[PDB]
Amino acid sequence: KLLPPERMKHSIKLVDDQMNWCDSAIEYLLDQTDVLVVGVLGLQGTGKSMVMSLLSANTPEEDQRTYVFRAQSAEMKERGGNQTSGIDFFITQERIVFLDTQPILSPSILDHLINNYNLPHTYVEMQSLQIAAFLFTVCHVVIVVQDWFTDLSLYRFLQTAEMVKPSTEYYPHLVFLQNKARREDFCPRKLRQMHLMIDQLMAHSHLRYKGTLSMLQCNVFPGLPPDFLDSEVNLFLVPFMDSLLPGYRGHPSFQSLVSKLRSQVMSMARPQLSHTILTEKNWFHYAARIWDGVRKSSALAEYSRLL
Amino acid sequence: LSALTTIGNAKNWALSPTVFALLSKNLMIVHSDLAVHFPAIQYAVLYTLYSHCTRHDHFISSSTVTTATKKHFSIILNLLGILLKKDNLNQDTRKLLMTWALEAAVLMRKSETYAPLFSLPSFHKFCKGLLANTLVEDVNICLQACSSLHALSSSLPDDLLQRCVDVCRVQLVHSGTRIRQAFGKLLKSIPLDVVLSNNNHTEIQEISLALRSHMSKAPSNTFHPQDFSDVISFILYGNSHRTNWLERLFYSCQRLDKTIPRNLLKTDAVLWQWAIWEAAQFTVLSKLRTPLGRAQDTFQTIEGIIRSLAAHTLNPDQDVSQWTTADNDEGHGNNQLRLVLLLQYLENLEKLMYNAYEGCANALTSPPKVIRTFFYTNRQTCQDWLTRIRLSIMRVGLLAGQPAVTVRHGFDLLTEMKTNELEVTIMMVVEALCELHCPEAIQGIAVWSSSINLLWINSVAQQAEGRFEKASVEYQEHLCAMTGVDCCISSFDKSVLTLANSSPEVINYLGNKACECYISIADWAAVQEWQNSIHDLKKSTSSTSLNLKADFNYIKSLSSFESGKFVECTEQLELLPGENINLDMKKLLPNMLSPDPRELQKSIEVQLLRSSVCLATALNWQSITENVVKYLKQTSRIAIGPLRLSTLTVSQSLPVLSTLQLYCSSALENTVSNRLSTEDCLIPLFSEALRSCKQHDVRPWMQALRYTMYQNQLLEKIKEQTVPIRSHLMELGLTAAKFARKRGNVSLATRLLAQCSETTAQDLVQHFKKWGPELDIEKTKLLYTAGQSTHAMEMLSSCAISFCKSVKAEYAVAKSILTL
Amino acid sequence: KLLFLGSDGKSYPYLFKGLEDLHLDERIMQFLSIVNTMFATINRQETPRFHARHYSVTPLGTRSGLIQWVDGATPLFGLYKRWQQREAALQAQKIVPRPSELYYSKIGPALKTVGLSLDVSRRDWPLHVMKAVLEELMEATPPNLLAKELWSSCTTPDEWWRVTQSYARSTAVMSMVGYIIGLGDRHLDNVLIDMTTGEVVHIDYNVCFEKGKSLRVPEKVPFRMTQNIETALGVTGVEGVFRLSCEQVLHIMRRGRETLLTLLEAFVYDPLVDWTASYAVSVWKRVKAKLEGRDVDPNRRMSVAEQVDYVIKEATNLDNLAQLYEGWTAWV
Ligand SMILES: CCN(CC)S(=O)(=O)c1cc(Nc2nccc(-c3ccnc(-c4ccc(NC(=O)NC)cc4)c3)n2)ccc1Cl
Ligand SMILES: O=P(O)(O)O[C@H]1[C@H](OP(=O)(O)O)[C@H](OP(=O)(O)O)[C@H](OP(=O)(O)O)[C@@H](OP(=O)(O)O)[C@H]1OP(=O)(O)O
Ligand SMILES: Nc1ncnc2c1ncn2[C@@H]1O[C@H](COP(=O)(O)OP(=O)(O)OP(=O)(O)O)[C@@H](O)[C@H]1O
Ligand SMILES: [Mg+2]
């Protein structure tokens, strides 16, 4: 007399490809409070679907075909086209809501929009900005994935997006994840440089990007002292799938790192959104309301008129 | 470093700075602090040294050129120990060191001429490093360490084996599967003389400390109702509705804004305890308003479940659903696991309620004011409910084989009785104490109750100590004196035995206890006589309430098997439940199996007997080996149940019956595929237990002897060369005889003495007047304990005279003279 | 109080004592170690270990000294203090008085009503008044302060049973050792308990060798056997494993009393020991008489069972608990 409602087997489309709300996840929500929301931001081929699938209901021992979130296929990499479009949705058994996101400023979207108000570039930029604001207003934790380092363009985009939010103010947490890492990225000398440049590039970001999710506290570097770094920011690295010196790949096992990241993300804080207690159904309604409100907003139009 | 490999890997240059010393002593600063910022240099140096040493067989033969390399193995071992003992190593470096250690360990056992290498301090440091390498987050490292330890299992001192036992115990319950199997095999390879030791376990103590620290912390109130519902459904009904879910739940229940060790997060015991404690806290903190129903709904549900379980104890034919029927071998074990978790949950709930209505000091944090004010007004209701359910809780606890729960509940019930429900409480408490081998508590309760008709408690107190003969005699005398009819049976002389050491429920208890006591010493004739006496007494008394709760078919089967008559044994075994006799594998245990450990032990014994008779009939190499091996493997897999259950809680010890059954199953499995060709087919019970297992009774040696005689008699049907079992059998018989005599069991001791040598005091005198000296000393000791001091003295003096003109006469003349 | 650090990063706290000779303390600890050594054989075939917790002390001349510090031990007075605070808070809902003030608040009115006054000498006090005051005080403090503390500090029932048995055996051994030596001033602040294992350990080893009988308020109880201590052993009380443990301890001590006697003989002839703080001869004779079984008897020697029974009865009778110092806390 206490059986669960139902178990989700595959992700659903929360936002349509034409920027339209899709109310089809109510049957998978209950009247429970204290829910966790995860958002993801990144480039075209960063690997958001793979990381989200591995962190929600998948393990590296599985195959990309049975993953919760559909990943890129062999025939799609050659054409250089995106795979995930719109916004996805999936809830695990632990009552954890996972939200995916389509690529931002991806050339595939522009190419598909060419053969279809002034220029498509402005429309793509506005769409990315709107999705970023939505992810920054109703998500408890946001993870940023970057295929390569020193992009110098995503930080500015995030700073501009945080200033175009709709509305005792609340700032969601952020996580810097570097996908497809190499041995050169697993050295203390480079780690310090990464931390200093990150701190100097987000001096007045007004966000929570430090004091939580410390890499040094994850036992990755057993002998590295915490005082060696001036300020250990919330950063994490992910290596590839599992030469005068044989062996010595230069980084820990991929499974161990993904497991540690999953545990750290699962044990993250869950602060209140507004000055009222929100439930699963209430959270969904709030998300739909803010989505509709941001669609017909004035900040986006004002910013677009300047371009 | 890479270029130096040309000279390092040379096959024969005598330069001033030796390459070995250069990479082992000159470049020793790279392991101090350079390994933290530049681990590549350390890895390269270690790789070069390993490559240069592996080409010369790690310099083992040496331990001109030979004289120069006379101190290389010690240096290598010392370096390995120092590096492995560290806690700030890299993954690649640790893996390379583990591989090198495994190779060295395997090569160390390649020959028997390297025996002196097991005493150097370098070897001890290496073993310490290997022991410290296991029990880490990495799985491959643990597997490599376990394999290396299992390789050179022998030649290690008791100090290392003691820690290895604790490591295997804590690792027996892991979220993975390979780790459990590896540690299980390693544990099986350890002799029983160390596994049964009463030494303190550091790992169990650490787990207990972590749990205590977690409970002592302030409440978190982060447990969601869905998690509680899932746990309740998995405990009351067995369905969890989840697909390593414990680790995920534990990680999701934590918070980063606001401390259990990570290495202990992979253990199911810690996770289960944490989940139960959190569920109890959520139930108490929610004013008993759990999603299961209203405030009284939870009480009614728990009361009904406990009442049904308690009722099933009286009549095992009830066959309670969701608690007695399983679908495979996993369900049977899961049932017992759920029962244990339920008992723990009830205990935690009681502790929380007590701390919530009054408050503890330096133990648990005080709950909010609302909880205290709500529990203070409804304290009478809670006390009444607990008191009303204590009787059922005691029965449930005894059924699940948890005497501690019933002992605590009985003590609380007796304390609350400050004002015919009194005899039953004492009965249950006495039985529980008897199962824990605590004669002092039994005697104390007997004396305390004497001031309120309860003179039979002394018999149970004496029985708990191991004196089965005296206990049986006292039981028969008490039954005859309280019933009015003669219920005595043939046995040894009462005068000699003493010098060597009314309600229907009470009558039934005494009869059942006497039957179990007689079965313990393996006296089939006595059991038959007892059954006849009970039948006659019942027919001449019309009790209509006395009935022995023991399947006589199993007893008859055991007697036939021990007598060597396999023809009748097969027919008797055919009527036993479960899978048919071997001529499909997962569902070996039958349905409607009670969660009582006694039933599981009986089923395991039946399976072993079936396999033994099957092999005996098949013998008189793949005809009957492809199925027997699988059958024994499944039996051994099911026998790891109690061992894991003991580790689930902080018990600091393991059951002797379960451990012996598992060891016997493993020995049988090895003898089936080896046909008695290796020493691994013998029982690890040696004489070493004389100075380390004096707190156990004679029951454990009975199983070992029973299964050893089978192989001894089976040797007559093998023409190929086999290992000698006469020495092992004689050693086991002598040790068992010594332990039997050390407790007054004159009958069992005499039986063992007669068996090794191949009812009246004069009978022993007329039948008694490498292991020769031990046998003579044992005979003299038995005669002295039998009351014939003169005969024992004469035999000891004659023995001393004979040993004085012997060859060795080292531990015989001295012992004989001292005893005399 | 200071602190030292070792090579293994382990902290070893210590205590600095000045103007107080500690030569006798080292000898007492040596005696405790020697008596503990005799329990090596019995500790091989028994679940509860026969051990007496103790620390090490080293003198730094003639007045200074260092005393080893033990962590993880909680004094028994703490539980009583918390209970008093909880009771006061509960009463105020709908500081705490000191033992001296609380005892006087009850001994004053009784004496005034019986016809006497508080100005009379302490020795000139009726026995019934003291007995009544003690009985009234015992009925106020519940005996579950320590009995339930161990239960609330455990995790599993097996652990609770193990700690209970260990605590009972440790308490019996410690009490017997204190009675043989003659340790006095056993108040709540001089006894510590380890919730991790349940063992009991003493602290102030100053009033020993029957030195408590010469104070302004002589003590007749051999050891501390208050309501809380007796209740913490179980429902049986002092007739279960406590009596058996005491008998075993006495048997072991009497079997090897030669070592203790020789050690004490060497103790007397020590130029660095100052008993004054023929006295040593009297102390040695008293210890020898206690070990030989002729504690209080002209020529009859009491057996182990009789000695244990007499000691237990003399340490639990109400005729001796009432006539004692207020700070000894005879009601808790
Ligand atoms: C709650 C307050 N406390 C209890 C009172 S406590 O002290 O603060 C405390 C004490 C421990 N345990 C501990 N460990 C090591 C040493 C002592 C200790 C303490 C005081 N005095 C002595 C002492 C002094 C003199 C002599 N010698 C003579 O008298 N004549 C020759 C012998 C002994 C020893 N106590 C643990 C925690 C805490 Cl809190
Ligand atoms: O030689 P064992 O047969 O193995 O047993 C003896 C002896 O047993 P008995 O009491 O039956 O003579 C005693 O065992 P416990 O009484 O402690 O259980 C014990 O000491 P005691 O003889 O003083 O009683 C010790 O003998 P001991 O230490 O005196 O030499 C012991 O083993 P060992 O004789 O081999 O040492
Ligand atoms: N750490 C990694 N190492 C190597 N290959 C990776 C790694 N992470 C992802 N990939 C691969 O890169 C591709 C990532 O595409 P995927 O569909 O998983 O997500 P995505 O890059 O977020 O896609 P989208 O274009 O829809 O934004 C896949 O082919 C995946 O196998
Ligand atoms: Mg994608």
Coordinates of N, CA and C in Angstrom, one line a residue, chain B residues 198 205 208-209 211-212 215 273 344 348 350-351 354 358-364 376 404-405 407-408 411-412 415 433 436 438 440-441 444-445 448 649-652 691 694-695, chain C residues 43-47 74 78-79 82-83 86 90 144-145 148-149 151-163 165 169 195-197 233-237 239-241 244:
Chain B
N198 N 40.0 -15.3 20.5 CA 39.2 -14.2 21.1 C 39.9 -12.9 21.1
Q205 N 36.2 -2.5 15.6 CA 36.2 -1.4 16.6 C 36.1 -0.1 15.8
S208 N 32.5 0.4 14.7 CA 31.7 0.8 15.8 C 31.9 2.3 16.3
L209 N 33.2 2.7 16.2 CA 33.5 4.1 16.6 C 32.9 5.0 15.6
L211 N 30.2 4.5 13.8 CA 28.7 4.6 14.0 C 28.4 5.4 15.3
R212 N 29.1 5.2 16.3 CA 28.9 6.0 17.6 C 29.0 7.5 17.3
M215 N 25.9 8.7 15.4 CA 24.7 8.9 16.2 C 24.9 10.0 17.2
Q273 N 23.2 0.0 8.8 CA 23.0 0.6 10.1 C 22.6 2.0 10.0
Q344 N 16.7 -4.5 14.9 CA 17.5 -3.4 15.2 C 16.7 -2.1 15.1
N348 N 16.3 0.7 18.1 CA 16.7 2.1 17.9 C 15.4 3.0 18.2
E350 N 13.1 2.4 20.4 CA 12.9 2.4 21.8 C 13.9 3.4 22.4
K351 N 15.2 3.3 21.9 CA 16.2 4.2 22.4 C 15.9 5.7 22.2
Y354 N 13.0 6.9 24.5 CA 13.5 7.1 25.8 C 14.2 8.4 25.9
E358 N 12.8 11.9 28.2 CA 13.5 12.3 29.3 C 14.8 13.1 29.0
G359 N 15.6 12.6 28.1 CA 16.9 13.2 27.7 C 18.1 12.5 28.3
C360 N 19.1 12.3 27.5 CA 20.3 11.7 27.9 C 21.4 12.7 28.2
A361 N 22.6 12.3 28.6 CA 23.7 13.2 29.0 C 25.0 12.7 28.3
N362 N 25.5 13.5 27.4 CA 26.8 13.2 26.7 C 26.6 12.0 25.8
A363 N 25.4 11.5 25.5 CA 25.2 10.4 24.6 C 24.5 10.8 23.3
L364 N 23.3 11.4 23.5 CA 22.5 11.8 22.3 C 22.1 13.2 22.5
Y376 N 6.2 13.8 26.3 CA 6.1 13.8 27.7 C 4.7 13.4 28.1
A404 N 20.7 -11.4 22.3 CA 20.9 -10.1 23.0 C 19.6 -9.3 23.1
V405 N 18.8 -9.3 22.0 CA 17.6 -8.5 22.0 C 16.6 -9.1 23.1
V407 N 17.4 -10.9 25.7 CA 18.0 -10.7 27.1 C 17.7 -9.3 27.6
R408 N 17.9 -8.3 26.7 CA 17.6 -6.9 27.2 C 16.1 -6.7 27.4
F411 N 15.2 -8.4 30.7 CA 15.6 -7.6 31.9 C 14.7 -6.4 32.1
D412 N 14.4 -5.7 31.0 CA 13.5 -4.6 31.2 C 12.1 -5.0 31.7
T415 N 12.3 -5.8 35.4 CA 12.5 -4.6 36.2 C 11.1 -3.9 36.3
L433 N 20.2 -16.6 27.8 CA 21.5 -16.6 28.4 C 22.2 -17.9 28.0
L436 N 24.0 -17.8 24.9 CA 25.2 -16.9 24.9 C 26.3 -17.4 25.7
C438 N 26.7 -17.8 29.2 CA 26.9 -16.9 30.3 C 26.4 -17.6 31.6
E440 N 27.3 -17.3 34.6 CA 27.2 -16.4 35.8 C 25.9 -15.7 35.8
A441 N 25.4 -15.2 34.7 CA 24.2 -14.5 34.7 C 23.0 -15.4 35.0
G444 N 23.1 -15.9 38.7 CA 22.6 -14.7 39.4 C 21.1 -14.6 39.4
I445 N 20.5 -14.8 38.2 CA 19.1 -14.7 38.0 C 18.4 -15.8 38.9
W448 N 18.4 -14.6 42.4 CA 17.5 -13.5 42.6 C 16.1 -13.9 42.6
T649 N 26.7 -6.8 12.2 CA 26.6 -6.1 13.5 C 28.0 -6.2 14.1
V650 N 28.1 -5.4 15.3 CA 29.4 -5.4 16.0 C 29.3 -6.6 17.0
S651 N 29.7 -7.7 16.5 CA 29.7 -8.9 17.4 C 31.1 -9.3 17.9
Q652 N 32.2 -8.9 17.2 CA 33.5 -9.2 17.6 C 33.8 -10.7 17.6
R691 N 45.5 -24.1 23.5 CA 45.9 -22.9 24.2 C 45.3 -21.6 23.7
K694 N 40.0 -22.5 24.6 CA 39.5 -23.1 25.8 C 38.1 -22.7 26.2
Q695 N 37.5 -21.7 25.6 CA 36.2 -21.2 25.9 C 35.1 -21.8 25.1
Chain C
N43 N 42.9 -14.6 31.3 CA 42.4 -13.8 30.2 C 42.5 -14.5 28.8
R44 N 42.9 -15.8 28.8 CA 43.0 -16.6 27.6 C 41.7 -17.4 27.3
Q45 N 40.9 -17.7 28.3 CA 39.7 -18.5 28.2 C 38.5 -17.8 28.8
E46 N 38.3 -16.5 28.6 CA 37.2 -15.8 29.1 C 37.0 -14.6 28.3
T47 N 35.7 -14.4 27.9 CA 35.4 -13.2 27.0 C 35.7 -11.9 27.7
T74 N 35.0 9.7 31.2 CA 34.0 10.7 31.7 C 33.8 10.4 33.2
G78 N 29.5 13.9 36.3 CA 28.9 14.6 35.2 C 27.4 14.2 35.0
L79 N 27.2 12.9 35.1 CA 25.8 12.5 34.8 C 24.8 13.1 35.9
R82 N 24.2 16.8 35.0 CA 23.3 16.9 33.9 C 21.9 16.6 34.4
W83 N 21.7 15.6 35.2 CA 20.4 15.2 35.7 C 19.8 16.3 36.5
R86 N 18.7 19.1 34.2 CA 17.5 18.7 33.5 C 16.2 18.8 34.4
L90 N 13.1 21.3 33.9 CA 11.7 20.8 33.8 C 10.8 21.5 34.8
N144 N 18.6 5.1 37.2 CA 18.8 4.9 35.8 C 19.8 5.9 35.2
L145 N 20.5 6.7 36.0 CA 21.4 7.6 35.4 C 22.6 7.0 34.7
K148 N 21.2 3.2 32.3 CA 20.7 3.5 30.9 C 21.7 4.2 30.0
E149 N 22.7 4.8 30.6 CA 23.7 5.6 29.8 C 24.4 4.7 28.9
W151 N 23.4 1.8 27.7 CA 22.4 1.4 26.7 C 22.2 2.4 25.6
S152 N 22.1 3.7 26.0 CA 22.0 4.7 25.1 C 23.2 5.1 24.3
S153 N 24.4 4.7 24.8 CA 25.7 4.9 24.1 C 26.1 3.8 23.2
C154 N 25.4 2.7 23.2 CA 25.7 1.6 22.3 C 25.1 1.7 20.9
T155 N 25.3 0.8 20.0 CA 24.7 0.7 18.7 C 23.9 -0.5 18.4
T156 N 24.4 -1.7 18.8 CA 23.7 -2.9 18.6 C 23.5 -3.7 20.0
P157 N 22.5 -4.5 20.1 CA 22.3 -5.2 21.4 C 23.5 -6.1 21.8
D158 N 24.2 -6.6 20.8 CA 25.4 -7.4 21.1 C 26.4 -6.6 21.8
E159 N 26.6 -5.3 21.2 CA 27.6 -4.4 21.8 C 27.2 -4.0 23.2
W160 N 25.9 -3.9 23.4 CA 25.4 -3.5 24.8 C 25.7 -4.6 25.8
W161 N 25.5 -5.9 25.4 CA 25.7 -7.0 26.3 C 27.2 -7.1 26.6
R162 N 28.0 -6.9 25.5 CA 29.5 -7.0 25.7 C 30.0 -5.9 26.7
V163 N 29.5 -4.6 26.5 CA 30.0 -3.6 27.4 C 29.4 -3.8 28.8
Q165 N 28.9 -6.7 30.3 CA 29.7 -7.7 31.0 C 31.1 -7.2 31.3
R169 N 32.6 -6.9 35.2 CA 33.9 -7.5 35.6 C 34.9 -6.4 36.0
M195 N 32.8 5.0 28.1 CA 31.6 4.5 27.4 C 32.0 3.7 26.2
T196 N 33.2 3.8 25.7 CA 33.6 3.0 24.5 C 33.7 1.5 24.9
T197 N 34.2 1.2 26.1 CA 34.4 -0.2 26.5 C 33.7 -0.5 27.9
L233 N 24.7 -2.8 37.0 CA 25.2 -4.1 36.8 C 24.1 -5.0 36.2
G234 N 22.8 -4.7 36.3 CA 21.8 -5.5 35.8 C 20.6 -5.6 36.8
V235 N 19.7 -6.5 36.4 CA 18.5 -6.7 37.3 C 18.9 -7.5 38.5
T236 N 19.9 -8.4 38.3 CA 20.3 -9.3 39.4 C 20.9 -8.5 40.6
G237 N 21.8 -7.5 40.2 CA 22.4 -6.7 41.2 C 23.8 -7.1 41.6
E239 N 24.5 -10.3 42.9 CA 24.4 -11.7 43.0 C 24.7 -12.4 41.7
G240 N 25.0 -11.7 40.6 CA 25.3 -12.3 39.3 C 26.7 -12.6 39.0
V241 N 27.3 -11.9 38.0 CA 28.7 -12.1 37.6 C 29.6 -11.3 38.6
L244 N 30.9 -13.6 41.3 CA 31.8 -14.6 40.8 C 33.1 -14.0 40.4

